């Protein structure tokens, strides 16, 4: 069975609901294990960042309407940071799953083989990302929460003016 993970979201400290993901561990096992462990916090402290390998209290720092919502920068909160559970970054595992629909879970990166902790959730088909970002899961519930994140007003760097925070997270 494929694992299922969750985020409980708050927007300016007001609960917005839970997003649940299914992870395609049969396609991208190393990528899925990283995300799963970042949900539970179970791998402890990031090697280079020296901060918890954990999405708890992390933000959705980049929102682009009709494109995606992105988070997981636990160490800098702005896209510059993060790290994987393996230390630093890990390689792009599979391009098998297409970015052909809303509500797919995919790895953010800064070029080839730079997977860390940052992830995004598509909000429309984004096929041009195929071969660039590894899709590794999908929303199963909480689509309306994702839409509420997507519709946030953002600053000049596409960061929501509201704090879109992962209040709690884990594995089901
Ligand atoms: Mg390779
Ligand atoms: Mg790129």
Curated annotation (Swiss-Prot):
Gene this protein is translated from: PPIG
Domain note: The RS domain is required for the interaction with the phosphorylated C-terminal domain of RNA polymerase II.
Tissues expressing this chain: Ubiquitous.
Annotated organism of origin: Homo sapiens (Human)
Record protein name field: Peptidyl-prolyl cis-trans isomerase G
GO cellular component, one term: cytoplasm
Domain of life: Eukaryota
Disulfide bonds: none
Localization (cell): Nucleus matrix; Nucleus speckle
Role: PPIase that catalyzes the cis-trans isomerization of proline imidic peptide bonds in oligopeptides and may therefore assist protein folding. May be implicated in the folding, transport, and assembly of proteins. May play an important role in the regulation of pre-mRNA splicing.
Section covered of the full-length record: 6 to 177 of 754
